[PDB]
Design a protein around this ligand. Structure first.
Ligand code: 3EU
Length: 167
């Protein structure tokens, strides 16, 4: 048993809700919240900007020191950093950004990072401003992640479309 409420069950291990991931993290304080990061960990917009704003920019300060030491992530890659006031840990995962011309085939690699963690609160990778087909992202998620994932989709109309079309 865990603390996630009102999620629709899609599969054995994937659950979904129409919710703001920031508000969900603040209420649940999960062990792991996933950030939809870029390779520079520049948390300007989207999920990353919203998570970072909720940490009062402490996520960005920590991330800048991570990059100064380690250099950028890979597309498809990840790193584990603090969850600050939102979670124990934040798993920063880089899904491909179609609007930057990154390879959509790296989405599966991105979701494989989730398998290193037993339970996660996560966004729908590569959707929204990332430019990929969300229906596709949800299919890759369910076909790749084996650990327990609670997806928090912000856009209402998108949530309804994803549930109605799910195979
Ligand atoms: O939750 C959503 O509506 C989809 C989405 C996913 C990501 Cl990763 C970023 C944005 Cl801005 C939006």
């Amino acid at each position: 048993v865990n603390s996630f409420s009102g999620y629709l069950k899609l599969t054995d291990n994937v659950y979904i809700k129409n919710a703001d991931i920031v508000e969900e993290a603040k209420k649940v304080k999960p062990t792991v919240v996933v950030n939809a990061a870029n390779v520079y960990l520049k948390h300007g917009g989207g999920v990353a900007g919203a998570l970072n704003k909720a940490t009062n920019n402490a996520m960005q300060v920590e991330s800048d020191d991570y990059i100064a030491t380690n250099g950028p992530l890979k597309v498809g890659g990840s790193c584990v950093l603090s969850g600050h006031n939102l979670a124990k840990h934040c798993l920063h995962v880089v899904g491909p950004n179609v609007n930057k011309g990154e390879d959509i085939q790296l989405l599966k690699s991105a979701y494989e990072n989730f398998n290193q963690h037993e339970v996660l609160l996560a966004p729908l990778l590569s959707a929204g401003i990332f430019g990929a087909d969300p229906i596709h992202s949800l299919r890759v998620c369910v076909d790749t992640v084996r650990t327990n994932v609670y997806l928090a989709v912000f856009d209402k109309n998108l949530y309804d479309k994803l549930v109605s079309s799910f195979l």
